[PDB]
């Protein structure tokens, strides 16, 4: 008589994401957060993964993705990070996101673009090439903390914490992620990667440089083992 928790999360995500403007949104978002707070790895039939202590060979991805469900309103799935890996700093243009750690520990660094020119004398280490000096833009580093399955969900919105980097801390980690709306490159909603620059206490201003997807980062799908989300 009772649907699985992941079914109920998907149903509530659909109700919640059909932006701030809509009425009933904050209450629906609060309810979704409370569902995610309850979620554990076992509810998805995902056993916690532990380190292999072996180097990662060049042909295997550092990160994998289990797809659970997607509509035009939201996407739902799990990202699984191997030991020592990171998902590089990236944005989510015009999107909301919700993350819940399932096992392991992640460091999430949260940032935003400030919407200015780099001062002429400013220097970075390593030094920038001329095209990079032209392209750097100001940002703000808002937070940088470690999260576990006990932390409860992390939220991002179109205008706050919209840039994040996610590092696996002391071994593999995995998290459930909801994006709303999902990315849509052909609609002009794409994922952009960034470098944070070190020139030569939070929140503090930083400098951001858009950069291609790192050569050693990519993500491949793998089968989702848990209860299925049904229309």
């Amino acid at each position: 008589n009772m649907a699985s928790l992941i079914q109920r999360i998907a149903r509530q995500a659909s109700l919640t994401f059909r932006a701030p403007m809509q009425p009933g949104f904050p209450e629906n978002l609060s309810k979704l957060k409370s569902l995610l707070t309850q979620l554990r790895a076992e509810d998805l039939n995902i056993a916690p993964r532990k380190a292999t202590l072996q180097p990662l060979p060049p042909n295997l991805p550092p990160v994998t993705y289990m797809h659970i469900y997607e509509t035009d309103g939201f996407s739902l799935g799990v990202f699984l990070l191997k030991s020592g890996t990171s998902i590089p700093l990236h944005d989510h243009p015009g999107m909301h996101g919700m993350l819940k750690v399932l096992y392991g520990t992640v460091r999430i660094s949260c940032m935003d673009k400030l919407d200015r020119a780099l001062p002429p004398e400013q220097q970075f280490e390593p030094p920038l090439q001329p095209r990079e000096r032209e392209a750097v833009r100001p940002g703000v580093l808002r937070s940088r903390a470690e999260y576990t399955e006990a932390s409860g969900p992390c939220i991002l919105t179109p205008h706050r914490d919209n840039l994040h980097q996610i590092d696996a801390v002391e071994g593999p980690a995995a998290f459930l992620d909801i994006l709303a709306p999902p990315y849509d490159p052909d609609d002009g909603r794409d994922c952009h990667y960034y470098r944070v620059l070190e020139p030569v206490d939070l929140p503090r201003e930083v400098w951001l440089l858009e950069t291609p997807q790192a050569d050693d980062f990519w993500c491949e799908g793998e089968p989702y083992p848990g209860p299925k989300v049904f229309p």
Binding site: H67, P182, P185, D190
Partner: peptide, 14 residues
């Protein structure tokens, strides 16, 4: 190769 994903946008999946 590049795939247009809904979960990390235009993604070089290699």
């Amino acid at each position: 190769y590049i795939v247009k994903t809904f979960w990390s946008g235009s993604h070089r999946q290699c």
